[PDB]
Short mmCIF file of C-alpha atoms and ligand atoms in Angstrom, two decimals:
data_model
loop_
_atom_site.label_atom_id
_atom_site.label_comp_id
_atom_site.label_asym_id
_atom_site.label_seq_id
_atom_site.Cartn_x
_atom_site.Cartn_y
_atom_site.Cartn_z
CA UNK A 1 62.64 214.49 16.13
CA UNK A 2 66.33 214.82 15.19
CA UNK A 3 66.76 213.46 12.20
CA UNK A 4 70.98 213.12 11.59
CA UNK A 5 72.51 212.56 8.22
CA UNK A 6 74.02 209.37 7.69
CA UNK A 7 76.00 208.81 4.74
CA UNK A 8 75.81 205.77 2.70
CA UNK A 9 78.63 203.23 4.23
CA UNK A 10 81.54 203.22 1.60
CA UNK A 11 80.12 206.08 -0.44
CA UNK A 12 81.77 208.53 -2.13
CA UNK A 13 81.64 211.51 -4.39
CA UNK A 14 82.92 209.18 -7.43
CA UNK A 15 79.42 206.89 -6.05
CA UNK A 16 77.11 209.72 -6.21
CA UNK A 17 78.27 211.16 -9.90
CA UNK A 18 77.39 207.46 -11.48
CA UNK A 19 74.02 207.79 -10.19
CA UNK A 20 74.04 211.37 -11.67
CA UNK A 21 75.19 209.75 -14.84
CA UNK A 22 72.75 207.23 -15.15
CA UNK A 23 69.01 209.50 -14.64
CA UNK A 24 71.30 212.01 -16.94
CA UNK A 25 71.64 209.52 -19.73
CA UNK A 26 67.76 208.23 -19.36
CA UNK A 27 66.17 212.13 -19.23
CA UNK A 28 68.29 212.14 -22.77
CA UNK A 29 66.88 208.82 -23.73
CA UNK A 30 63.51 209.05 -23.13
CA UNK A 31 62.59 212.25 -24.52
CA UNK A 32 59.40 211.67 -25.85
CA UNK A 33 57.70 211.18 -22.47
CA UNK A 34 54.64 214.13 -22.56
CA UNK A 35 54.92 215.25 -26.08
CA UNK A 36 58.58 215.86 -26.19
CA UNK A 37 58.66 217.79 -22.73
CA UNK A 38 60.91 214.50 -21.21
CA UNK A 39 61.47 213.82 -18.04
CA UNK A 40 62.84 216.66 -16.56
CA UNK A 41 59.74 218.53 -15.14
CA UNK A 42 58.27 215.80 -13.58
CA UNK A 43 61.44 215.55 -11.43
CA UNK A 44 61.83 218.48 -10.35
CA UNK A 45 58.01 218.69 -9.16
CA UNK A 46 58.81 214.81 -7.09
CA UNK A 47 61.66 216.37 -5.62
CA UNK A 48 59.85 219.81 -4.30
CA UNK A 49 56.54 217.22 -3.65
CA UNK A 50 58.52 214.91 -0.69
CA UNK A 51 60.99 217.83 0.82
CA UNK A 52 57.07 220.23 0.60
CA UNK A 53 55.47 218.27 3.45
CA UNK A 54 58.02 219.08 6.39
CA UNK A 55 56.55 220.87 9.10
CA UNK A 56 59.37 223.14 10.97
CA UNK A 57 57.25 223.73 14.14
CA UNK A 58 57.73 219.89 14.98
CA UNK A 59 60.28 218.24 12.32
CA UNK A 60 57.47 215.53 10.62
CA UNK A 61 57.67 215.53 7.22
CA UNK A 62 60.34 216.63 4.46
CA UNK A 63 62.77 214.68 1.91
CA UNK A 64 64.84 212.46 4.40
CA UNK A 65 62.13 209.74 5.46
CA UNK A 66 61.76 209.03 1.79
CA UNK A 67 58.17 208.11 2.87
CA UNK A 68 56.73 208.37 -0.87
CA UNK A 69 57.05 204.98 -1.40
CA UNK A 70 54.30 204.27 1.19
CA UNK A 71 50.95 204.39 0.06
CA UNK A 72 49.58 207.01 2.43
CA UNK A 73 52.07 209.41 0.25
CA UNK A 74 51.74 207.79 -3.40
CA UNK A 75 48.23 207.55 -3.33
CA UNK A 76 47.63 211.22 -1.77
CA UNK A 77 45.64 213.47 -3.94
CA UNK A 78 48.44 216.13 -4.62
CA UNK A 79 51.02 213.92 -5.84
CA UNK A 80 48.68 212.67 -8.86
CA UNK A 81 50.67 212.24 -12.08
CA UNK A 82 54.01 212.07 -10.09
CA UNK A 83 53.89 208.56 -10.53
CA UNK A 84 55.92 208.55 -13.94
CA UNK A 85 58.74 210.44 -11.98
CA UNK A 86 58.69 207.16 -9.32
CA UNK A 87 58.75 204.18 -12.62
CA UNK A 88 60.98 206.41 -14.53
CA UNK A 89 63.87 206.08 -11.30
CA UNK A 90 62.52 203.01 -9.91
CA UNK A 91 65.14 200.92 -12.72
CA UNK A 92 67.86 203.02 -11.33
CA UNK A 93 66.95 202.56 -7.81
CA UNK A 94 67.59 198.71 -8.78
CA UNK A 95 70.80 199.37 -10.89
CA UNK A 96 72.55 201.19 -7.74
CA UNK A 97 70.96 199.97 -4.18
CA UNK A 98 72.65 201.58 -1.95
CA UNK A 99 71.22 204.97 -1.63
CA UNK A 100 68.57 205.58 0.04
CA UNK A 101 65.17 206.65 -1.16
CA UNK A 102 65.34 210.13 -0.17
CA UNK A 103 68.78 210.87 -1.60
CA UNK A 104 67.24 209.42 -4.97
CA UNK A 105 64.04 211.42 -4.88
CA UNK A 106 66.64 214.38 -4.53
CA UNK A 107 68.89 213.95 -6.72
CA UNK A 108 66.56 213.29 -9.52
CA UNK A 109 66.00 216.69 -8.99
CA UNK A 110 69.27 218.26 -8.81
CA UNK A 111 69.87 216.51 -12.20
CA UNK A 112 66.56 217.51 -13.74
CA UNK A 113 67.99 220.99 -13.28
CA UNK A 114 71.24 221.12 -14.33
CA UNK A 115 70.79 219.02 -17.51
CA UNK A 116 67.89 221.45 -18.25
CA UNK A 117 71.02 223.90 -18.67
CA UNK A 118 70.23 225.52 -14.91
CA UNK A 119 72.11 226.46 -12.35
CA UNK A 120 74.14 223.89 -10.51
CA UNK A 121 72.94 223.06 -7.17
CA UNK A 122 75.01 221.68 -4.45
CA UNK A 123 73.65 218.43 -3.41
CA UNK A 124 74.08 216.58 0.00
CA UNK A 125 74.30 213.02 0.94
CA UNK A 126 73.01 211.40 4.22
CA UNK A 127 68.84 210.79 3.93
CA UNK A 128 68.05 207.44 5.91
CA UNK A 129 64.80 205.53 4.93
CA UNK A 130 62.22 205.72 7.81
CA UNK A 131 59.39 203.41 8.67
CA UNK A 132 55.83 203.47 7.20
CA UNK A 133 54.93 204.92 10.54
CA UNK A 134 56.82 208.29 9.45
CA UNK A 135 54.59 209.18 6.68
CA UNK A 136 53.29 212.08 6.52
CA UNK A 137 49.19 212.75 6.10
CA UNK A 138 47.66 214.10 3.26
CA UNK A 139 46.77 217.49 3.08
CA UNK A 140 50.46 219.48 3.49
CA UNK A 141 51.34 220.13 0.40
CA UNK A 142 49.22 223.71 -1.14
CA UNK A 143 46.65 224.47 -3.07
CA UNK A 144 46.28 226.30 -6.73
CA UNK A 145 42.76 228.56 -6.21
CA UNK A 146 44.45 230.99 -3.62
CA UNK A 147 46.33 234.38 -3.12
CA UNK A 148 49.48 235.68 -2.29
CA UNK A 149 48.70 235.86 1.46
CA UNK A 150 47.93 231.76 1.77
CA UNK A 151 51.25 231.51 -0.10
CA UNK A 152 53.84 234.02 2.07
CA UNK A 153 51.59 231.84 5.17
CA UNK A 154 52.19 228.25 3.50
CA UNK A 155 56.03 228.97 3.04
CA UNK A 156 57.12 230.18 6.25
CA UNK A 157 55.84 226.44 7.65
CA UNK A 158 58.60 225.62 5.52
CA UNK A 159 60.77 228.94 6.74
CA UNK A 160 60.89 230.66 3.15
CA UNK A 161 60.95 233.87 2.95
CA UNK A 162 59.89 235.92 0.36
CA UNK A 163 62.65 236.40 -2.05
CA UNK A 164 63.33 232.70 -1.70
CA UNK A 165 59.40 231.73 -2.72
CA UNK A 166 59.84 233.95 -5.75
CA UNK A 167 62.95 232.27 -6.75
CA UNK A 168 61.65 228.66 -5.77
CA UNK A 169 58.11 229.47 -7.91
CA UNK A 170 60.39 230.10 -10.93
CA UNK A 171 60.44 226.33 -11.72
CA UNK A 172 57.13 226.67 -13.00
CA UNK A 173 58.33 227.86 -16.16
CA UNK A 174 58.89 223.62 -17.01
CA UNK A 175 56.55 221.33 -17.91
CA UNK A 176 52.85 221.49 -18.29
CA UNK A 177 49.76 221.05 -16.01
CA UNK A 178 47.54 218.54 -17.11
CA UNK A 179 43.55 218.23 -16.78
CA UNK A 180 43.67 214.65 -15.32
CA UNK A 181 45.86 215.38 -13.38
CA UNK A 182 45.29 218.89 -11.18
CA UNK A 183 42.12 219.87 -13.13
CA UNK A 184 43.83 222.75 -14.70
CA UNK A 185 45.29 222.29 -18.17
CA UNK A 186 48.16 224.13 -20.34
CA UNK A 187 51.92 225.09 -19.93
CA UNK A 188 53.17 228.32 -18.41
CA UNK A 189 55.97 229.55 -21.25
CA UNK A 190 57.13 228.61 -24.54
CA UNK A 191 60.81 226.80 -23.27
CA UNK A 192 58.97 224.22 -20.99
CA UNK A 193 62.40 222.16 -20.63
CA UNK A 194 65.03 224.45 -20.84
CA UNK A 195 65.72 226.68 -17.42
CA UNK A 196 65.29 229.83 -17.89
CA UNK A 197 63.80 233.12 -16.13
CA UNK A 198 61.02 232.86 -18.70
CA UNK A 199 57.87 233.01 -15.69
CA UNK A 200 59.11 236.53 -14.50
CA UNK A 201 58.78 237.92 -17.91
CA UNK A 202 55.68 235.73 -18.82
CA UNK A 203 53.61 237.15 -15.58
CA UNK A 204 54.93 240.64 -16.55
CA UNK A 205 54.49 240.95 -20.04
CA UNK A 206 51.24 239.05 -21.39
CA UNK A 207 47.98 239.85 -21.12
CA UNK A 208 45.86 237.50 -18.91
CA UNK A 209 42.85 237.52 -18.88
CA UNK A 210 40.72 235.24 -15.54
CA UNK A 211 38.99 232.72 -17.62
CA UNK A 212 37.10 228.75 -16.02
CA UNK A 213 38.02 225.58 -17.72
CA UNK A 214 36.79 222.28 -17.98
CA UNK A 215 37.32 221.28 -14.64
CA UNK A 216 35.38 224.09 -13.47
CA UNK A 217 38.20 225.81 -11.52
CA UNK A 218 39.64 229.40 -12.61
CA UNK A 219 42.80 230.04 -14.68
CA UNK A 220 44.72 233.21 -15.86
CA UNK A 221 45.15 232.83 -20.04
CA UNK A 222 47.45 234.85 -22.09
CA UNK A 223 46.63 235.27 -26.06
CA UNK A 224 49.31 233.09 -26.55
CA UNK A 225 48.72 229.98 -25.62
CA UNK A 226 50.37 230.23 -21.50
CA UNK A 227 48.85 229.89 -18.12
CA UNK A 228 49.40 231.22 -15.17
CA UNK A 229 47.38 229.64 -11.71
CA UNK A 230 45.60 231.72 -8.96
CA UNK A 231 48.85 231.71 -6.49
CA UNK A 232 50.86 232.65 -9.39
CA UNK A 233 48.95 235.34 -10.39
CA UNK A 234 49.47 236.67 -6.93
CA UNK A 235 53.45 237.30 -7.21
CA UNK A 236 52.06 239.87 -9.41
CA UNK A 237 49.05 241.13 -6.69
CA UNK A 238 51.60 241.40 -3.82
CA UNK A 239 54.14 244.33 -3.89
CA UNK A 240 57.11 242.66 -2.00
CA UNK A 241 56.54 239.73 -4.62
CA UNK A 242 56.17 242.04 -7.59
CA UNK A 243 59.47 243.76 -7.30
CA UNK A 244 61.50 240.62 -6.45
CA UNK A 245 59.40 239.06 -9.56
CA UNK A 246 61.04 242.14 -11.48
CA UNK A 247 64.52 241.73 -10.55
CA UNK A 248 64.34 238.46 -11.71
CA UNK A 249 63.03 239.07 -15.11
CA UNK A 250 65.77 241.73 -15.73
CA UNK A 251 68.67 239.47 -13.95
CA UNK A 252 68.57 235.36 -14.91
CA UNK A 253 71.57 235.11 -13.32
CA UNK A 254 70.36 236.78 -9.80
CA UNK A 255 67.29 234.64 -10.73
CA UNK A 256 70.30 231.25 -10.86
CA UNK A 257 71.80 232.31 -7.76
CA UNK A 258 69.18 232.80 -5.73
CA UNK A 259 67.15 229.40 -7.41
CA UNK A 260 70.19 227.31 -6.31
CA UNK A 261 70.80 228.63 -2.89
CA UNK A 262 66.36 227.97 -2.34
CA UNK A 263 66.17 224.37 -3.67
CA UNK A 264 69.29 223.24 -1.97
CA UNK A 265 67.34 224.85 1.49
CA UNK A 266 64.19 223.17 0.45
CA UNK A 267 65.80 219.58 0.16
CA UNK A 268 67.76 220.20 3.14
CA UNK A 269 64.78 221.23 5.54
CA UNK A 270 64.66 219.04 8.68
CA UNK A 271 68.22 217.35 7.86
CA UNK A 272 70.84 217.56 10.94
CA UNK A 273 74.02 216.92 8.61
CA UNK A 274 77.12 216.22 11.70
CA UNK A 275 80.72 218.45 10.56
CA UNK A 276 82.28 215.03 10.17
CA UNK A 277 79.97 215.34 7.64
CA UNK A 278 80.78 215.22 3.74
CA UNK A 279 80.97 218.80 2.46
CA UNK A 280 78.18 219.53 -0.40
CA UNK A 281 78.52 217.63 -3.54
CA UNK A 282 78.87 219.44 -6.69
CA UNK A 283 77.97 216.94 -9.80
CA UNK A 284 79.50 217.61 -13.37
CA UNK A 285 76.94 217.70 -16.51
CA UNK A 286 77.28 214.70 -19.35
CA UNK A 287 78.63 217.57 -21.45
CA UNK A 288 80.74 218.62 -19.06
CA UNK A 289 82.20 214.80 -18.49
CA UNK A 290 81.97 214.55 -22.67
CA UNK A 291 79.23 211.60 -22.06
C1 LIG B 1 51.85 227.59 -4.39
C2 LIG B 1 52.65 226.34 -4.80
C3 LIG B 1 52.33 225.98 -5.80
C4 LIG B 1 51.59 225.44 -6.18
C5 LIG B 1 49.72 225.32 -5.74
C6 LIG B 1 51.87 224.21 -7.59
C7 LIG B 1 51.21 223.21 -8.11
C8 LIG B 1 51.05 222.89 -9.36
C9 LIG B 1 49.87 222.76 -9.85
C10 LIG B 1 47.96 222.22 -9.52
C11 LIG B 1 50.86 221.57 -11.66
C12 LIG B 1 50.40 220.49 -12.44
C13 LIG B 1 50.18 219.65 -12.20
C14 LIG B 1 49.57 218.66 -13.18
O1 LIG B 1 48.47 218.72 -13.54
O2 LIG B 1 50.44 217.78 -13.69
C15 LIG B 1 52.12 222.01 -10.71
C16 LIG B 1 53.53 221.30 -12.05
C17 LIG B 1 54.30 221.48 -11.52
N1 LIG B 1 55.28 222.13 -10.58
FE1 LIG B 1 54.21 223.08 -8.92
N2 LIG B 1 52.86 224.59 -7.54
C18 LIG B 1 53.58 225.01 -6.59
C19 LIG B 1 54.73 225.70 -6.21
C20 LIG B 1 56.09 224.60 -7.11
C21 LIG B 1 57.09 224.49 -6.63
C22 LIG B 1 57.42 225.47 -5.49
C23 LIG B 1 58.02 224.07 -7.67
C24 LIG B 1 59.61 223.87 -7.92
C25 LIG B 1 60.62 223.95 -7.13
C26 LIG B 1 57.43 223.98 -8.94
C27 LIG B 1 57.49 222.95 -9.78
C28 LIG B 1 56.41 222.52 -10.85
C29 LIG B 1 56.64 221.27 -11.95
C30 LIG B 1 58.53 221.40 -12.33
C31 LIG B 1 55.71 221.63 -12.31
C32 LIG B 1 55.51 220.76 -14.08
C33 LIG B 1 54.99 219.13 -13.71
C34 LIG B 1 54.61 218.27 -14.66
O3 LIG B 1 55.49 218.71 -16.25
O4 LIG B 1 54.62 217.26 -15.07
N3 LIG B 1 55.59 223.74 -8.59
N4 LIG B 1 52.15 222.80 -10.43
#
């Protein structure tokens, strides 16, 4: 498969900044969601999940086709809980009906990160909606109960190397796990809706204890009340990952620089961009516009 990027006919940078401004003003408004965590975390989880189905071998899956809108992917067990992110965005799609789904789902992700004080992420437009028969089968998103060998191997299918995997994984400082959605329960840290390098400092500085939970899944619990999944804990079990974890616990700006570069790569995998295409857009924040 080749998927070439097609810009929504007639639209420019100013059209997209209005969709951003709309998502961002609704984030500020619906701040009570999940015990005042807000929707920022579920929206970067939805953008990684629509992108994380990509297969580098045959170019199936990925953000391009906006196929999460279809039943098979929408009802994937690994996507449980993302329906709240979908319903949040649905009014914004009625307001700006010209934007494609893959462009809206991925721009929700970019807007959430910049509005939770994270790095600026360059974004590109052009994903085109594709038919129901292009919806990837379930079972391509990753399990939680596994080790660093499983992680290295899983992320090579999206051709992410070790540094890109540790940088991308830091976006778990955000939000919390929910027993009813995943069989796991608890937050990764204190600042769960501001973007910081806290995931790396917690993994190196806490006294983690392996325990089972009420769903019979294991997880690492610390004294502080935080939790990590087995796959997260793995990053300090592997020596290549552990050095990169140390670097980011000591330099939040190297963390932000590399997260940025990797998160745009994850959102553009599987998409061919012509060079008549617009350069990547750097959207301003509400604060930068005075809104
Ligand atoms: C091997 C990798 C990963 C596994 C096993 C994994 C698994 C999970 C699980 C079990 C949850 C909680 C679901 C719930 O109960 O609601 C979760 C939440 C989340 N994930 Fe991941 N994750 C992985 C990678 C990533 C990556 C790469 C990102 C982002 C770039 C990410 C971002 C998030 C966010 C923001 C949440 C919070 C969701 C919320 O608050 O509702 N995850 N993840």
